[PDB]
Amino acid sequence: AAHVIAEDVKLLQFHVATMVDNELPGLPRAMQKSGRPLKSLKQRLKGKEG
Amino acid sequence: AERGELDLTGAKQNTGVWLVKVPKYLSQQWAKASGRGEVGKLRIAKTQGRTEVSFTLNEDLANEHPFVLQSVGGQTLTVFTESSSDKLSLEGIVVQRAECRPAASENYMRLKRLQIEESSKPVRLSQQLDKVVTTNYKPVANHQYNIEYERKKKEDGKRARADKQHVLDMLFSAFEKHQYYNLKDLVDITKQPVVYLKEILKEIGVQNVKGIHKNTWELKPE
Amino acid sequence: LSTMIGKGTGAASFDEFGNSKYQNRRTMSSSDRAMMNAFKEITTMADRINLPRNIVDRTNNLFKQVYEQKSLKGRANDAIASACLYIACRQEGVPRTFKEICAVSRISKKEIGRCFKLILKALETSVDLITTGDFMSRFCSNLCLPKQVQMAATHIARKAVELDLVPGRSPISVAAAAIYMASQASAEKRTQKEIGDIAGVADVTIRQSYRLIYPRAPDLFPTDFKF
Amino acid sequence: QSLGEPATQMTLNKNVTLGVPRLKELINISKKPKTPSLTV
Amino acid sequence: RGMFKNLLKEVRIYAQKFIDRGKDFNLELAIKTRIISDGLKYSLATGNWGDQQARAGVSQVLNRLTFASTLSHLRRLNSPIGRDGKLAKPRQ
DNA sequence: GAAGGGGGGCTATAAAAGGGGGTGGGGGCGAATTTTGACAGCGAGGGCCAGCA
RNA sequence: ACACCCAGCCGC
DNA sequence: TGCTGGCCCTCGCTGTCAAAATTGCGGCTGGGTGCGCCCCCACCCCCTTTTATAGCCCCCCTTC
């Protein structure tokens, strides 16, 4: 169905975004099993230990 | 004259009643008396400018209770009644308020402590076991629920494959009761093997899609 | 390799009906789901009788080998699970009885017996035959009996096995018989019902072993016991 | 560095504000000062 | 309290799963002994005070360096004010 | 009616036959602060127009 | 034989 | 023909609010870990029956 394609491309949107930028407001943070929100590119470049 | 009417003759007579607070041991003694006829004597004495109210416990009931009056005009209190015949009535209006206190000063606390022992009876605390338990997960060849269920699968029996005419009559008779049915409900009512019943109803019944719960079957031939 | 999508912090991800529009699909194949549920069942089964985690990990190893052997699809995964638990308890030299596994499992003794028979036939392994002396420590300790009772009962059981009073008798029956020997000779005494409760053998089986072990009693005892 | 090394020695926070908060309030343009004042 | 709520939810799901099929259920297997025995262990071991956004550093390894260190570590308190925050008032 | 006893059923071993039911596998449903910046209201203004004189 | 997370502690 | 007040259509100061970022340097140590679920299909096991074998155990019977 068209709604299946829409929700799946929206999910892939979310995954590409959280690959690029994770700290942005609104969407939930992509996390591994058992906590530990994964270290995206912002978390690797910006800040003290970046 | 109606069921919801409250009799108001007591208010028209301007009957004045007294409301009094008493401690719980007096109530317990009055309950233990079980209405023998007398529980004590109420004493009142008025001086030239003061009043004195007290209550004396019955000597038989025991085997002084001074009263303190209080302000009443802060509220208007009246008493109504409900009967088993649903005839509501008003008794009267409270005109004086008092409270009952014990004359015992130091020994009374002892009774309070005993009531504490009467009130700390149902509260319950954890205990220490010197020995760890033995009778947990006792080695049993088959569970009681399991052996009862396996026993019950012997006499109810497996659903025998029946002839086509009888199951057709059963399914149309069930269709006469209600328009739609679920497959698991048809299996329960007709009491037939799922694959066989599905094979019989494939010829005459047809799946119609319903987005409200699931794709289900129709027993109508058309 | 996967990731979980958590709950949203901001309210900007919520739809008009809520539901946050972004949630974990959790596909992870069927076989991995089956293995995960089986491992959960193994852990919650072995915790009931308080097994050490080495036996749990050995059970998981046997379950993964059986599941990848692809021969026992026709039986409930829980049966293979409890069978692997029995195999791992056997292979560490601390065997449990079938009834003890059946107590902490939803499965009858017939099914676990047949599944154990099919595991030994299929996975091609050999297990050591049980002896009476393995069960003695667990039985005495759970019955709260001292060390002298332990040593006396173990000596009685091993002597009764080697001298041949009990042809073809189950080791569980003669083990509980040795428990009854050591119990009915000291200050502390244990009733037939307690012995059957802790061993799983029926009181008739205890009386059968009693009446068959009763002649030649001082020879089975150790050198000193303080009668 | 010759400005910020005389910043780790004075204290923090009938006179106007003075110290590290004044330094922070000066090098930021600080559109809402805490105690702005004139000298007429 | 939270973990007993979890245990009751779990035994409710188990009892429903073996009551919808229409038979009795054994209570011994119903209660998962994993939950209470593991979660309290996990919380005291890690110091994270929850079922993994909760309070952190509640539980610490005891400071066996001297007897005064042990006593001062056992009689310690802890404020929840965010330790990195550049405040002045609550610390006084 | 508690306890000991007897008789009988349960367990596994093979094998065949058909079909019902249990089981697993795949697929579908829903404790602190700054600056830049825009939304939205209120308000005034130049303009555009029909009517006045 | 790591990598995150957490805690404690040192000097200013 | 010049003058007048109505609203149209455009601009914008402003209050509050939303968005988004940052919040000392270096270091030594120990410790822990690594959603929510129903339905529809294939495929296999047990339902019978027989019999030998024996220990084990349920159930009823019997005793006093």
Side-chain angles (χ1 to χ4, degrees):
Chain A
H3 69 76
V4 175
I5 311 292
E7 61 77 10
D8 187 74
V9 71
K10 271 151 188 167
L11 183 137
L12 190 152
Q13 189 54 32
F14 161 80
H15 274 313
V16 171
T18 197
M19 191 275 258
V20 167
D21 294 332
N22 193 0
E23 190 159 288
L24 76 177
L27 59 82
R29 315 301 151 62
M31 321 185 218
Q32 187 43 248
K33 291 174 178 284
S34 195
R36 174 40 182 67
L38 60 85
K39 199 178 289 288
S40 80
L41 276 297
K42 295 190 57 168
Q43 304 292 316
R44 294 227 286 191
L45 308 173
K46 87 181 184 73
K48 170 59 185 295
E49 298 260 343
Chain B
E2 212 172 347
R3 181 176 171 282
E5 281 191 357
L6 305 91
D7 186 74
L8 72 164
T9 57
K12 288 178 181 182
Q13 295 147 24
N14 285 48
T15 313
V17 305
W18 287 14
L19 187 62
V20 55
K21 179 67 176 176
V22 293
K24 279 297 305 197
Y25 69 92
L26 186 56
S27 67
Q28 277 176 305
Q29 278 279 14
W30 290 358
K32 283 162 70 177
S34 82
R36 66 191 182 190
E38 176 167 320
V39 297
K41 298 287 95 175
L42 189 74
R43 192 62 270 150
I44 46 182
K46 182 169 174 178
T47 70
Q48 62 271 16
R50 282 300 318 129
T51 187
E52 173 50 66
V53 189
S54 68
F55 171 75
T56 45
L57 193 72
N58 201 324
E59 292 273 19
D60 175 46
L61 188 57
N63 297 125
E64 195 64 60
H65 290 64
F67 276 29
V68 176
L69 307 190
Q70 46 202 279
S71 179
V72 187
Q75 271 202 313
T76 76
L77 275 296
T78 186
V79 178
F80 89 108
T81 50
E82 43 173 346
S83 60
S84 298
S85 56
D86 294 331
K87 289 187 176 182
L88 299 170
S89 297
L90 199 67
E91 295 293 327
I93 305 100
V94 183
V95 292
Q96 187 61 268
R97 295 180 66 250
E99 63 158 38
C100 171
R101 294 172 54 75
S105 179
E106 293 178 353
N107 66 80
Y108 180 77
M109 293 180 183
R110 192 258 297 157
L111 193 144
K112 290 300 304 194
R113 283 197 300 282
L114 298 169
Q115 192 163 2
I116 289 295
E117 184 177 358
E118 290 162 353
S119 302
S120 45
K121 268 172 192 73
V123 65
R124 200 191 308 115
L125 310 178
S126 303
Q127 282 77 15
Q128 203 168 310
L129 272 69
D130 291 331
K131 303 195 177 284
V132 69
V133 66
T134 300
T135 62
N136 263 6
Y137 312 109
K138 59 170 283 183
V140 167
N142 213 356
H143 294 295
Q144 185 273 358
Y145 87 88
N146 190 80
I147 203 163
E148 278 166 13
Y149 182 67
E150 287 310 88
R151 194 191 51 52
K152 200 178 185 299
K153 295 288 279 288
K154 305 305 301 182
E155 292 80 8
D156 300 335
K158 300 181 77 182
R159 297 174 294 220
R161 194 180 283 210
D163 51 346
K164 310 172 75 201
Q165 51 270 35
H166 156 67
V167 300
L168 285 163
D169 291 331
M170 202 46 256
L171 67 84
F172 289 107
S173 88
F175 184 42
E176 289 165 353
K177 265 79 76 176
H178 187 273
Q179 194 66 232
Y180 313 133
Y181 281 101
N182 199 351
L183 181 63
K184 56 176 70 176
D185 288 25
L186 294 174
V187 165
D188 276 18
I189 299 154
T190 64
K191 187 144 180 226
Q192 283 296 279
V194 186
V195 179
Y196 183 62
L197 190 64
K198 186 176 182 178
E199 190 277 327
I200 298 292
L201 67 85
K202 190 194 298 182
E203 298 179 357
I204 68 169
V206 68
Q207 296 180 9
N208 60 338
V209 64
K210 306 180 186 179
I212 186 163
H213 187 279
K214 79 175 197 84
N215 179 59
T216 194
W217 290 96
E218 292 293 322
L219 286 60
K220 190 80 84 177
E222 69 275 16
Chain C
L1 282 72
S2 76
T3 187
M4 180 189 77
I5 308 165
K7 294 182 221 93
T9 72
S13 56
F14 297 147
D15 201 6
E16 63 184 1
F17 197 73
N19 210 49
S20 67
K21 184 177 182 292
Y22 290 152
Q23 284 296 156
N24 51 320
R25 290 291 255 274
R26 211 192 197 299
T27 302
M28 301 325 88
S29 164
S30 187
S31 56
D32 186 74
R33 206 193 313 296
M35 279 195 259
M36 187 42 204
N37 300 329
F39 297 160
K40 196 87 76 180
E41 181 56 340
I42 292 288
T43 314
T44 191
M45 185 180 288
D47 205 306
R48 289 196 249 277
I49 54 169
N50 274 346
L51 283 164
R53 199 178 180 85
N54 62 344
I55 297 169
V56 170
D57 289 329
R58 182 171 292 265
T59 310
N60 299 352
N61 174 340
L62 276 296
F63 199 97
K64 292 177 72 68
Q65 297 178 357
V66 166
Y67 190 85
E68 294 294 328
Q69 184 67 42
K70 300 175 177 282
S71 312
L72 279 293
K73 293 175 62 180
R75 312 202 83 86
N77 281 339
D78 306 335
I80 297 89
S82 307
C84 288
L85 194 47
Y86 186 81
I87 295 278
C89 276
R90 180 70 67 78
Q91 262 171 38
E92 301 305 270
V94 296
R96 302 283 199 281
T97 71
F98 279 96
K99 297 186 182 77
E100 286 153 21
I101 308 298
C102 182
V104 299
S105 175
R106 68 168 196 82
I107 309 162
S108 305
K109 207 189 81 182
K110 73 195 297 167
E111 176 61 33
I112 198 54
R114 291 176 189 191
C115 190
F116 165 80
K117 282 289 190 68
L118 294 169
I119 292 291
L120 62 83
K121 166 268 190 193
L123 172 143
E124 191 86 69
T125 194
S126 65
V127 300
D128 192 3
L129 186 59
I130 64 169
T131 194
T132 67
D134 303 350
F135 303 160
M136 302 314 327
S137 66
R138 178 167 62 258
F139 290 5
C140 295
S141 62
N142 197 322
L143 280 190
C144 192
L145 307 179
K147 175 71 170 183
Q148 214 64 24
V149 167
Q150 273 194 30
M151 187 66 204
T154 318
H155 196 75
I156 287 167
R158 67 187 291 274
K159 280 207 65 60
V161 170
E162 61 86 20
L163 219 156
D164 186 74
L165 282 75
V166 286
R169 198 62 58 188
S170 73
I172 180 62
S173 299
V174 302
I179 300 299
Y180 196 72
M181 294 298 102
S183 167
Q184 305 285 88
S186 186
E188 311 156 320
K189 280 188 156 41
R190 305 305 205 231
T191 302
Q192 308 291 3
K193 290 313 296 302
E194 201 146 29
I195 301 299
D197 196 3
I198 202 53
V201 278
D203 57 3
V204 174
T205 317
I206 308 295
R207 282 193 274 242
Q208 188 69 10
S209 296
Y210 203 49
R211 288 183 173 181
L212 189 151
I213 198 67
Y214 182 76
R216 175 155 40 181
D219 197 1
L220 295 174
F221 271 37
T223 60
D224 51 350
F225 154 80
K226 299 162 284 182
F227 275 45
Chain D
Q1 307 173 345
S2 66
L3 279 148
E5 192 284 329
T8 77
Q9 320 279 357
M10 71 204 62
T11 73
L12 193 143
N13 188 25
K14 202 186 298 201
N15 54 345
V16 309
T17 187
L18 178 42
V20 163
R22 187 64 185 169
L23 197 51
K24 189 173 70 169
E25 191 205 10
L26 271 193
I27 70 185
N28 294 359
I29 300 318
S30 193
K31 308 184 191 183
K32 291 185 178 182
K34 53 166 301 179
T35 182
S37 288
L38 269 71
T39 310
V40 179
Chain E
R1 184 201 260 201
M3 293 176 70
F4 204 81
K5 182 63 68 66
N6 205 337
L7 178 65
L8 288 174
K9 190 180 74 172
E10 187 56 30
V11 63
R12 177 196 84 129
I13 289 293
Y14 176 90
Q16 187 154 90
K17 196 163 67 73
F18 290 168
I19 207 62
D20 61 2
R21 284 165 67 187
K23 34 176 171 173
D24 210 306
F25 74 111
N26 190 359
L27 201 43
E28 310 281 7
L29 188 153
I31 316 185
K32 303 220 312 189
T33 62
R34 173 71 190 308
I35 297 169
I36 304 163
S37 179
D38 203 318
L40 296 165
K41 164 177 174 288
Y42 174 87
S43 296
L44 285 159
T46 62
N48 295 355
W49 212 239
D51 198 56
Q52 187 67 359
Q53 70 90 35
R55 294 186 293 272
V58 186
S59 179
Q60 300 191 357
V61 62
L62 199 59
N63 199 359
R64 295 289 184 183
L65 196 56
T66 187
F67 200 64
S69 186
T70 312
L71 283 177
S72 176
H73 195 190
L74 296 161
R75 304 171 96 259
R76 192 174 287 203
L77 291 63
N78 186 47
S79 304
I81 300 296
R83 66 188 177 180
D84 199 8
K86 317 307 177 192
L87 289 68
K89 267 298 310 180
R91 294 173 190 262
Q92 272 147 30

